[PDB]
Amino acid sequence: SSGLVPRGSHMVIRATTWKDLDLPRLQHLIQSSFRRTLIPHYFETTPLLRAYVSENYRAAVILTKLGNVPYLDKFAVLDDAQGEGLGRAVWSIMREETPQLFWRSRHNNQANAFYYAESDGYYKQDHWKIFWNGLHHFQQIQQCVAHCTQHPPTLID
């Protein structure tokens, strides 16, 4: 459980349990990155698959269990960490061991250019963009789309 992975200049914490992360520090990173509130009891009610957090908690990728394919629940990068390559670092380390992935994004999310560039697939809905990597089977994709549709939002306000 838990260790550090280098990506170029940067060092990244890989954790498979919330117990191995500084949760108050991680919540502050997420809420500061999105300028929104995480729903109450987020860590307690979210089944972690793997989290990747930069050593100094300036960027994070959180994968969770939502059906058969790993679900990217949060990609948080501090605005103040911009240009340092930190977001790309945590994303890259995650992708190296996560060949299949899906996630969702609001239409106005500042990360969307990055998501278009990185994703293999995309499905547009009225209020969400659904993205995936590594999925070819159309039922798997359909199930991922349904999971995004049915999953309550965990960023509010």
Place this chain on the structure above:
Amino acid sequence: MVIRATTWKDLDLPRLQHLIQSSFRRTLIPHYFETTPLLRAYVSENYRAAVILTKLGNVPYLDKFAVLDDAQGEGLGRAVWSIMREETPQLFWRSRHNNQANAFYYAESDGYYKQDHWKIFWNGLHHFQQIQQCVAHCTQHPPTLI
């Protein structure tokens, strides 16, 4: 100011070929116009932007979106695309990674799917059954640019 053509014989072909080759900076494979079943083409009067829809399965297939760099600056490509969309509610098309129009395609599409090294885009399809048919047509369709 936009030509709408349902047969190749109503277009200036070496001219259209020159537009296509300038836009893509690649060569249009020999015998393109005679082995490509036209559905309809929208071509700017001075052949600086074109949208070519062809017959490839049940859904209209956008085979070529060719716009000169300066025409793209002027928004002419977007204008021709808009004219096409007003009478073409359903369509699919494909692109490679370096395609200058990808940002536009990401914005215009209702989705995309990667097969081989193509991204296959669609508009106006929402059922995965329809989407699956379109992707299948792109797979065994050879490139027309070299």
